[PDB]
Symmetry: C2
Subunit: 330 residues, 2 copies
């Protein structure tokens, strides 16, 4: 036990169907099989999607993950960032790797559709309708259901526009028990997000505040944790990428939190992109070190062994990688 | 003659092929057959595209236009707003109505893809590559070529990000002679846009600065016109829609400019949307008068007769509706 999920639950849904909490295994709570920044579709002429090569590439990464003992990936790709459940299902059915997809949108400057629905009507209820339908019935008539709601906020505040999504999410959460994972911008708003969602009636045991590794002051992480929610160092491997701290700094914070007993509330991920949508990313020369360990095998090969040699126990490692994911999503 | 297009020309391209300047006929220089605010795709579950109903609805509007003697529509829909040349081609082949589609993106807060390419590399050259390919070879391997480049800027300035597109556009323009139509936000930046593009080497005779009806001070229109470019009152029918002036005000300005002899530089359009992408628009109760005349038959039925009874001549009307479009796009 400890802090178990409240009332209203629905068996964890993956792109290939419902899976039991115990079948989840080691999990990466925040990754992107395919991803495109909003607008990517507008570059379809020179940046078309090569299905054959994306499939070949993604299943390969999937296989490398299974070999590491990772049995599940939570794909956090927002509805406006290329989210494609049917494709994810292909990858999963081809490899056996389990994948949960999300429902939600990126922050304010991403797109403009709902900012517009909001000027003309009740956008909260429209977002609520969409989230609930995708979480209980499916996405785009495919029958594939989202297994997490994804929320995002800006750096300086959770804007009134962003809050429409947080309330729609809170509602669906209370009604269905579906988990909620978030994006925080540049290490800010973690506590505000936690305060808001719990105040809205969302179960702190089904809430994971993301990109918390974006902040290096542990007092900041401790304040979020006070709310009873889990937090994720989900961008491990992306170092100094205009903003992000280094892994050295992330681990310093993690080991402090771990030695303070917060293991039941810490999750680990990379926030990697296996295949980019649109025109392949032009990576400058100086950016190389920053993205060097920014691939999904980094935690399994570098992070988990580094934590262990630091005194973190095998049980603490299993709690973060298997224990937490099973309660959060299962 | 007068101010005819410079060197480097390419026969006007429509979704169904090249058309001769003389085949253009009366034209609406800025309209949207289908349109979706960026992000619309993310609402695919409850706001899917009903092809059968969009086709039935759009050809109908097309037929009403042909009956008015309008033989061509310049669809100004940006690459990030649902632009779909294949669909436009269906509408055109089904009715005979001629349609030219565009190449380009909406302003800064619309999407984020190129803001990202810009942090990692040479976005100007990537936008240039895309624009040129779509204007000379085609869009998405369909062989359908864009017949206009579409540019947009914000209200307070033509941002450094927005200027990447203006330079890519200027380049393609000099190289291919393809026309350029713009969007101006809330009646500002008209002169700045005209100054910038001509300074970049773009032909003022193949440049139409849009949404100029958004400003009601004719001194503002006169300054843009000084640059030798044409300007369009292309949102006729959208009144008071949070910002926009009333048609009464637009016509007051138009008749002043007309009686000052600027007929060779004035174009008329509605900026209507025949079929919305995403969830159908929820139109409040107070918004009704604002969108009442916001449909493509408004100029033919209300505007052109109102101008005539005001003293505007049949020749001045033909110059705006046929003369200008033929030089600009043909
Ligand atoms: Co994120
Ligand atoms: Co992410
Ligand atoms: Co516009
Ligand atoms: Co428009």
């Amino acid at each position: 036990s400890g802090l178990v999920p409240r009332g209203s639950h629905m068996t964890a849904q993956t792109v290939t169907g419902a899976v039991a909490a115990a079948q989840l295994g080691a999990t990466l709570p925040h990754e992107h099989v395919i991803f495109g920044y909003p607008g990517y579709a507008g570059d379809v002429t020179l940046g078309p999607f090569d299905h054959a090569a994306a499939l070949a590439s993604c299943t390969e990464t999937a296989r490398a993950l299974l070999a590491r003992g990772i049995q599940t990936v939570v794909d956090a790709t927002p509805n406006d960032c290329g989210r494609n459940p049917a494709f994810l299902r292909e990858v999963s059915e081809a490899t056996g790797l389990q994948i949960l997809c999300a429902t939600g949108f990126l922050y304010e400057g991403a797109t403009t559709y709902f900012k517009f629905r909001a000027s003309l009507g009740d956008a909260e209820s429209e977002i609520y309708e969409m989230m609930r339908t995708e979480v209980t019935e499916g996405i785009a008539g495919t029958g594939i259901r989202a297994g997490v709601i994804k929320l995002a906020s800006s750096r300086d505040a959770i804007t009134p526009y962003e809050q429409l999504f947080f309330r729609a999410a809170a509602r669906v959460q209370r009604e269905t028990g579906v988990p909620i994972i978030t994006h925080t911008q540049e290490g800010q708003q973690g506590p505000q997000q936690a305060e808001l969602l719990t105040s809205l009636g969302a179960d702190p045991a089904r809430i994971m505040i993301g990109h918390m590794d974006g902040n290096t002051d542990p007092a900041y992480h401790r304040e979020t944790l006070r709310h009873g929610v889990s937090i994720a160092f989900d961008r491990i491997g992306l170092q100094g990428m205009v903003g992000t701290p280094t892994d050295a700094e992330r681990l310093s914070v993690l080991t402090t939190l771990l030695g303070e007993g917060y293991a039941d509330r810490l999750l680990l991920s990379h926030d990697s992109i296996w295949h980019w949508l649109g025109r392949p990313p032009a990576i400058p020369e100086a950016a190389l070190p920053a993205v060097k360990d920014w691939h999904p095998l980094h935690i399994s090969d570098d992070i988990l062994p580094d934590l262990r040699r630091r005194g973190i126990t095998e049980e603490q490692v299993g709690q973060m990688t298997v224990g937490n994911p099973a309660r959060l999503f299962g």
